[PDB]
Amino acid sequence: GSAVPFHGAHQAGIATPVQDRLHFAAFDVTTEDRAAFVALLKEWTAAARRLTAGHAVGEGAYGGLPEAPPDDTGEALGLKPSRLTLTIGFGPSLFTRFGLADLRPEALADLPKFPGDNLDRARSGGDLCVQACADDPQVAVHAIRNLARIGFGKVVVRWSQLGFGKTSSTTPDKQTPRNLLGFKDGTRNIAGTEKDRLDRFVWAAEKDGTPWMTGGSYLVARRIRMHIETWDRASLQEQEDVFGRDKGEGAPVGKAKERDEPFLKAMKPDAHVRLAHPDSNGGATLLRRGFSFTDGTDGLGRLDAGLFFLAYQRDIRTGFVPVQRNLATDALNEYIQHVGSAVFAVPPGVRDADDWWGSTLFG
Amino acid sequence: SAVPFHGAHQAGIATPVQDRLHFAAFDVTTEDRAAFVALLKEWTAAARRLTAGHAVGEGAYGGLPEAPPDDTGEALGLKPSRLTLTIGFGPSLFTRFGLADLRPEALADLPKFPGDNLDRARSGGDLCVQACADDPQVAVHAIRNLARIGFGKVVVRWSQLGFGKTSSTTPDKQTPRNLLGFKDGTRNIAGTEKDRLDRFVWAAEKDGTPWMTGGSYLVARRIRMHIETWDRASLQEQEDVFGRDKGEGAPVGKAKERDEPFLKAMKPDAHVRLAHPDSNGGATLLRRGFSFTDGTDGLGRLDAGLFFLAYQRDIRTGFVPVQRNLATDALNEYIQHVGSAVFAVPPGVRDADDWWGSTLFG
Ligand code: HEM
Ligand code: HEM
């Protein structure tokens, strides 16, 4: 039920405990007026401060002039904050606008092409994103819908993704959730309490070269289809060999308990965990924060499902990219396909009631 | 925690409404009646496991290394979560297995209605399974595993996820709001109302289809909302569309949500006025639908709405007259019916030896 604080050095929704639901929206900018865009960021911030406290935006959902559309669309009336977080990010394409070219962060690297991808361009990229996470899906949709409405005429929704259930953990003291392949996903991640690891691996620092991004992070989103029919035909041992962990307990091969440290050399050479581990990737460590999805059927008799992968890191070049490169030979590749992608620079936090999303970028 | 699976009636009709839905329509590929009965028995056994929070078959792990696990594993560590699994039989089922004359007359095909825009690929179906639970992953796991168990005998035609309230934080007695921001459910048949269920929801033997006694008939409509145009309407326009105020949800002229409506005070094509039993020869529904939000369409607009479900004793005396009377509804400007199906939902699984469809198949 409770609220997650909206203000801080960092935006919430990163280190925060992972909530049950996701509504992620990517927007494109339509206005060429920088002052109008700044005004939108401030109005959006004000809205987010209301939303994340369980309050209606603007002057509320009713009680205004009868002839006026309500300021808030009303479907969150009577609900709780439900741990809603709203996290904004700026895509590389934003920096072509508003005289921002020289402020594009070097750590906001475009991804290379990866073997096997079939990326839907229409559901990739975006000038900006808002990640809405909450325990109540109606709270999350209300937030996105009202931000979109506020932004009408200045931004448009390019694409969106709903996540029905989490597949990630920033809280190793709680149960690790399972993805739709049936495996625990999030055992060896980064905890919200691991201050030093967050500083090392997640938060941008001023000396990294982009002052406005200090206390921000960089986000990679990958929409990944799962080949459920093929997976579900695989043997237990094939599935366990793919990952390098057993399925029921989720321990590394040869170990009895989920959180026992892996002995990588006992895994298959191609195993996902072996290839993805920091030790395989120059120490590169990610904060994974994704969710599962299911998008109807394939039209031909089969349920369609997948995982909407999210990773936060201090630098895309030393986080996602080396890891995904090392997954070129991953045994998992037989059962997945990346079908959408985007990257964003997620600014530092909203410091207090007078601050606003993007203030360090825009001034 | 759990809702009992066995009973005179299938659970998921009159039982308390859960927070989440995974609804699947299936088409039958087998022509062999004995093989189909064998599937119904296997599905029943699976449903007994699933609704008690247990893995299907021999489980999700621990079996022979070389064998695919019987259960795909994504519900391990979760709870029963009030899961119910409710099966229904579409009109098209009855053209198989020599069942033709056992198609109930109360399982009427819907007429075409003004403004319909039905996607035929997301309509119909030989069978349905309505999975409802508080944890969406529990519902998805159930549908995924039933589909897996049935593969070779059935395929999935279409699939819809939905949500209502989140009961951890929202009082059970509080009426849900739909995505237009209005309370939705105020005047409905509740599963507590045993006498009203016998009048309006359960099929009786005397109604003409003995195998259906204690079953019900289900209408599903996938109803998209034009969210952005709705949100541009004034508060008074919105309230006029329904005949209730938005904040409290009281009828025009009344102070409280649950005060009985005075229909004459509503506009003549207000939704409540057109939908009320008094306007429809006494026709009364058990509405049991769920909101949906599926994404953004190819114009940037929200793909969202109501996955409307109604249970009734006879489609001809329930949904059809009411929907016909919505032809001039002021709501029509803001909605579009884009998927549809009907199903005969049999009586319950009476005990541990019984199986879904036993009254139909014998
Ligand atoms: C549908 C796709 C994916 C599935 C099903 C999946 C599944 C898993 C599972 C079951 C684990 C073991 C438990 C744990 O989190 O420690 C794991 C670990 C991991 N995954 Fe994935 N994963 C997927 C995609 C990716 C991608 C795209 C990346 C990065 C490019 C990635 C990076 C990692 C990392 C870094 C670990 C932890 C390794 C360690 O330090 O022990 N995963 N994944
Ligand atoms: C997206 C579409 C729809 C929306 C947003 C909607 C919304 C509402 C709302 C807000 C109410 C008032 C509160 C309540 O008593 O539940 C209501 C009542 C009702 N609706 Fe709808 N409805 C929709 C579609 C339908 C359809 C398709 C039918 C049947 C064909 C239907 C039948 C009813 C009935 C019977 C009532 C109760 C009237 C009474 O007895 O007072 N609705 N609906």
Numbering used by the authors:
A (entry chain A): 55 to 417
B (entry chain B): 56 to 417
Could you pull the original sentences from the published paper?
The Y345F variant, creates a DtpAa protein with no Tyr residues within 15 Å of the heme on the distal side with the double variant, Y345F/F347Y, mimicking the distal heme Tyr arrangement as in DtpA.
Dye-decolourising peroxidases (DyPs) are a distinct structural family of peroxidases possessing an α + β dimeric fold that houses a b-type heme coordinated on its proximal side by a His residue.
